[PDB]
Design a protein around this ligand. Structure first.
Ligand SMILES: Oc1cccc(O)c1
Ligand SMILES: Oc1cccc(O)c1
Ligand SMILES: Oc1cccc(O)c1
Ligand SMILES: Oc1cccc(O)c1
Ligand SMILES: Oc1cccc(O)c1
Ligand SMILES: Oc1cccc(O)c1
Ligand SMILES: [Cl-]
Ligand SMILES: [Cl-]
Ligand code: NA
Ligand code: NA
Ligand SMILES: [Zn+2]
Ligand SMILES: [Zn+2]
Lengths: 28, 21, 28, 21, 28, 21, 28, 28, 21, 21, 28, 21
């Protein structure tokens, strides 16, 4: 699904911004 | 998970913090 | 450091693209 | 790590795959 | 609405480019 | 607003210019 | 001036996400 | 046509990263 | 074109490579 | 402006909020 | 050179916007 | 090329247009 693919791109960007130094996993 | 919660309705940065480490 | 901050933004985007369904951690 | 390796010289997508899960 | 949220992200980048030194006001 | 104008039909550069200061 | 130009692009995306419904003013 | 417009933006970024030194042709 | 090929179903890196110079 | 404030040293989310409407 | 690599990412997005239906050829 | 022209000085919309097909 391209819609999920594009959504996830923006999600990663948001997580990078908010998660600060702690970071994040992206899994789906 | 994050796709079901946040690709189907807008999650704020506050809400997204829940997916951080 | 803003330079690292901007670099990391692009790194996350690249990792999202290449890591496919397996995903990734961003930690620094 | 990734910043030292890839913010100081260009890492290709192939090289970046090494940082995947 | 997520479609609009993603659209907005691209709109702000486009305004950044188009508006140059004028800048812009973004409101949904 | 901009979302109504530009998220259902593509806005041209001129249309986008509308929202500049 | 290119470095500032690139930084600005990231700033507007961050403001988009931080400011949400309120929007923001980008005045360079 | 907006959905395709947003998709295209992501496509060109992906091509940038995939194609590296060779560059790419974006012909819509 | 690429938009028709790639904007509904996800194109793999391999598929995208076809559009490189 | 924001570019002067935020393009050398990282601005926190709190700092960025100052530029919201 | 990473600065150029990041610059290029923004250049391709700008070309996407500026060139519209004409498209573009990207080469470094 | 574009990197030489536009990565040390900001390219205007007209300068960027140079690289369109
Ligand atoms: O709900 C979402 C989906 C994608 C990006 C984002 O910031 C929020
Ligand atoms: O070496 C890098 C740094 C940032 C993004 C990228 O794709 C590669
Ligand atoms: O109509 C739109 C929507 C998003 C970006 C853009 O350049 C135009
Ligand atoms: O099919 C697609 C569409 C957009 C980005 C991408 O990497 C793949
Ligand atoms: O200081 C900055 C510069 C660019 C993006 C950001 O989130 C913070
Ligand atoms: O000179 C530049 C470099 C990158 C993006 C842009 O719009 C202009
Ligand atoms: Cl999108
Ligand atoms: Cl950058
Ligand atoms: Na205006
Ligand atoms: Na040309
Ligand atoms: Zn998008
Ligand atoms: Zn950047």
């Amino acid at each position: 699904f391209v819609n999920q693919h594009l959504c996830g791109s923006h999600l990663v960007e948001a997580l990078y911004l908010v998660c600060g130094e702690r970071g994040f996993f992206y899994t789906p | 998970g994050i796709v079901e919660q946040c690709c189907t309705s807008i999650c704020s940065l506050y809400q997204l913090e829940n997916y951080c480490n």
